[PDB]
Structures are given as C-alpha cells and as structure tokens.
Amino acid sequence: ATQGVFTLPANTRFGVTAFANSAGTQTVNVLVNNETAATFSGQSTNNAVIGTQVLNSGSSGKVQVQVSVNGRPSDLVSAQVILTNELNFALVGSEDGTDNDYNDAVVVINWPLG
Amino acid sequence: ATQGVFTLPANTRFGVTAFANSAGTQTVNVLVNNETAATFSGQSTNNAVIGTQVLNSGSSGKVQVQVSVNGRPSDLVSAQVILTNELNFALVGSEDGTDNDYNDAVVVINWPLG
Amino acid sequence: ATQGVFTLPANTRFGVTAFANSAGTQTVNVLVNNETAATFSGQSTNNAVIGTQVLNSGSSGKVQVQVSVNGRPSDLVSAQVILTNELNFALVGSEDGTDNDYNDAVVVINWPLG
Amino acid sequence: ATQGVFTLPANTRFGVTAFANSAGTQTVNVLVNNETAATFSGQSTNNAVIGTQVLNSGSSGKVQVQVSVNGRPSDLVSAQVILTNELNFALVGSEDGTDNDYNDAVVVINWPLG
Ligand SMILES: CO[C@@H]1O[C@@H](C)[C@@H](O)[C@@H](O)[C@@H]1O
Ligand SMILES: CO[C@@H]1O[C@@H](C)[C@@H](O)[C@@H](O)[C@@H]1O
Ligand SMILES: CO[C@@H]1O[C@@H](C)[C@@H](O)[C@@H](O)[C@@H]1O
Ligand SMILES: CO[C@@H]1O[C@@H](C)[C@@H](O)[C@@H](O)[C@@H]1O
Ligand SMILES: [Ca+2]
Ligand SMILES: [Ca+2]
Ligand SMILES: [Ca+2]
Ligand SMILES: [Ca+2]
Ligand SMILES: [Ca+2]
Ligand SMILES: [Ca+2]
Ligand SMILES: [Ca+2]
Ligand SMILES: [Ca+2]
C-alpha cells in the first residue's frame, strides 16, 4: 500500500519534524501538492532532530514524505491518529537497511498549530 | 481515564520532544518511575521545539508526561501507536485553557532508537 | 477531554460493532447528528459481539458513542486511526468498574464500506 | 514493510473479528505461532461479520493475519493502537482489487478480554 501520503484539511498550517537513528545519512523531503516544501538531512544514532518546520497544506491538502540515504529511497511505514476528535498526528517510519527497526528516519507531522 | 502514562520496555532508550502552541509558557516534565528525568519550557504559537532529549525507561519501564502552565496542571490526551510491529510512538496533547485544541504543549515519545 | 465523539465524512456509510467484557450488562447507544441511531445490550466476559450495524453519517457526520450500565454512564476512552490515507477506524473503550481495563464495552467504527 | 503481524503478550486471550466489503469471497486466516488458529470465509458489500472468535496468543505471542481472494493473497495494511496504556487494538485492512479502499476484508483484534 502507498505510505507517507496524507490528506490534511486544506489551507492548514502544520508542523513537520524529522529524527535520525541510523549509521546512514538521512535525507527527508516533504512535498506539498507535489512541490518540495522542506528538505532535512543529518546523521545520528541518537534521535537527532535533523529538521523541524512550519508548512501549509495549501489548496489540495496533500502532503507526502519521502526518505532517502545517499540517493537510495527508503521503504516507508505510516499512519495518522486523531485524539479527542481534534489533535492530529501523521507518522512515518523508514528503513534503509536489513534490521527492520523502521526508525532510520522518523517523521512526525502535527496539526492544528497556534 | 489516566492519560500521559506509558509502559515502555524496561531499560530502553527513548526520545522525547515537546512543541508549544499557546500564548502561555508551557512546562513539560517527563518522569521515569515517578521521578523527573527531563524538564522543558518555552513559549510559542508556531509549534517551536521547546525541548528534546534521550532518556532511559529504567528498571520499571514507567514513563509519564506532565504539563503545567502558570502553576496549574494541564489536562492531557494521549495514545500509543505501533507501526510494522516495531516502531513505537507515545503521543500527548495538553490543554491549558478554554478552546480545547489540546495542542498547547504537544509531546512525542519515540522508540526504539539507534 | 471529550471522548467517544467523532467527525466522519458527510453522507457516508459506516459500520459500528460493540463487544462486551464485563460482569455487568452493557448498553451501547450510537448517536448520529444527536439522534439515537442504534442500540445494543448484553452481558459477556468473552468478547461477545452484542451488536453490529451499518449506519449513514448523514449531513453532519457527527457520531457519538455512549455506554451505560443500567442507566449509569461509563467513562470512555477513544481515538481515530487512518491507514494508507483511506481506511478509517474510530475506537472506543469504556470502564464501568474499578479495575481499569477499559474493555467493559469496546466499540469499533469503520469506514468506508462497500 | 511487513503488515498484519502483531506481538501480543504470551498466553493471553484476544478477540478477532473480520468484516467483508467486496464482491469477492474473502478468506481470512489467523496464525498463532505460525499455525492456523482460525479461518473465516464469506462475502458481503455491507460490512457483514464473516467471523468472530476468541483465541489464545500462546508461547511466543506472535499473531499473523493473512487475507486471500480466489486463492490470491491480498495486500495488507495494519497498525496497533493502545488507549490509556491498557486497551489494545490490532487493525488490518486488505485490498483484493484496483480501487484501493483496503476495506475488502477488515480485521480487528482486541485485548485484554474479560
Ligand atoms: C547499517 O544499518 C543502519 O545503521 C544502524 C546503526 C542501525 O540504525 C540500522 O537500523 C540502520 O539501518
Ligand atoms: C490563552 O489561550 C492559549 O493561547 C492561545 C494563543 C491559544 O493557543 C490557546 O489554545 C491557548 O490555550
Ligand atoms: C465487576 O467488574 C466488571 O466485570 C469483571 C468480570 C471485569 O470484566 C471488570 O473489568 C468489570 O469492570
Ligand atoms: C471488484 O472490486 C471488489 O468488490 C467491489 C464491490 C469493491 O468492494 C472493491 O473495493 C473490491 O475490491
Ligand atoms: Ca534500520
Ligand atoms: Ca536504526
Ligand atoms: Ca488551548
Ligand atoms: Ca493552542
Ligand atoms: Ca473494567
Ligand atoms: Ca472487563
Ligand atoms: Ca477494494
Ligand atoms: Ca471494498
């Protein structure tokens, strides 16, 4: 199944934050309506916050997360969870190797802000 | 029901990261077996990261998040999500006021780490 | 925070299914747009499906689950999860007693159907 | 990533319930310790319950859900959610065709039971 793609409410500010847990250098791209809106990169095995940014879901609400390591696309897992019918989290994990921890880059999207 | 309380695997490293979205200064306390292990503070209405840290769940595995604003504990919502039977998120929102966005302080706990 | 209230897409069919795991008879009421749309009752300590039904979310999309034992409201917990940006589950647990399993009645709402 | 595999606590009862939303006949297999523990087959486009059973998780606690239609394995999506640090849901969707609803068979696993 497709993973790392989320439909947000249109024209809504959201946070996106990436964490690294791998020997490999992670590169995370965040697309909004297929336009590159953010790119984060770094290397840590201790959960470094390689990037955090406020974006806007725009007219389409379509947000996609992609992760690669020195050009190789990582396999993704994802889900969205809503608390008290209001508070939204869109979650991504990614695997760059063979141990299947899916934590090599972790991406958390949250809304609403403010 | 109790919120913001999570049983992690014993003696396991985890990340904890807090974001703020309130006019008020948020204080986030992370407790491991009922003892404060990290404290973050800050004020933002733009989802700023007010802290991030790596902790160990210790011999009991018991982790709790508490949030307070202007000397007053905030109400919490929370849940845990597991993706591909491996990647764990413990998610918390908090409400300090009247509007019920539960985003005043947003706290993300993730494990395993690298 | 409010629990057991979900916003579904308008004019969409959904399933609602209730399970019982308590010494006490559970009553589950499902409201759509503030009108009772389904009701199930039963006692089981073995996860009986005390009712399952297909409903339409109508113009509002507002769906509320209430659980009671002989007229006494149970405390609820709830969340919504979305898989592959398409498959939705709204989840409710309830506690009628002192042991805090929140499984006394468990309610699952799923959409889309068909 | 692997989907439909969940680690439950050892020697613990859980409920499994399958719903169908497809023109095709769905076959849902539940494997406990890599051996078939339940099988459900049926057809509905109205979310009918094609099986519901209580099972034990056994020594390893490893539970796997597989879905097929006309003998051809369906693609799966899944996740696990925990409410109030106690109430567990393991959730599976499956796609037998081209429309990507992942509702063709929907499987809900819940624990603890009464
Ligand atoms: C070489 O493998 C990569 O780096 C290791 C230190 C681990 O984080 C592993 O999950 C990751 O895939
Ligand atoms: C005074 O109210 C607090 O600050 C505002 C700017 C909002 O973020 C609100 O949710 C928060 O409770
Ligand atoms: C009297 O307690 C009720 O019935 C028991 C058999 C348990 O299922 C318990 O969770 C429930 O609250
Ligand atoms: C022919 O396609 C199958 O049956 C239809 C009635 C739909 O439920 C569709 O999702 C399913 O994959
Ligand atoms: Ca890895
Ligand atoms: Ca890793
Ligand atoms: Ca608020
Ligand atoms: Ca706020
Ligand atoms: Ca109980
Ligand atoms: Ca019970
Ligand atoms: Ca389908
Ligand atoms: Ca279908």
Numbering used by the authors:
A (entry chain B), B (entry chain A), C (entry chain C), D (entry chain D): 1 to 114
Sentences copied from the publication:
The present study is devoted to the PA-IIL lectin from Pseudomonas aeruginosa, an opportunistic human pathogen capable of causing lethal complications in cystic fibrosis patients. It displays high values of affinity towards monosaccharides, especially fucose – a feature caused by unusual binding mode, where two calcium ions participate in the interaction with saccharide.
All crystal structures belong to the P21 space group except for the S23A mutant that crystallizes in space group C2. In case of mutation of Ser23 to Ala23, the original hydrogen bond between Ser22 and Asp96 is retained. Mutant S23A is even more interesting. The hydroxyl group of Ser23 in the native protein interacts with the fucoside O5, creating an unfavourable entropy contribution.
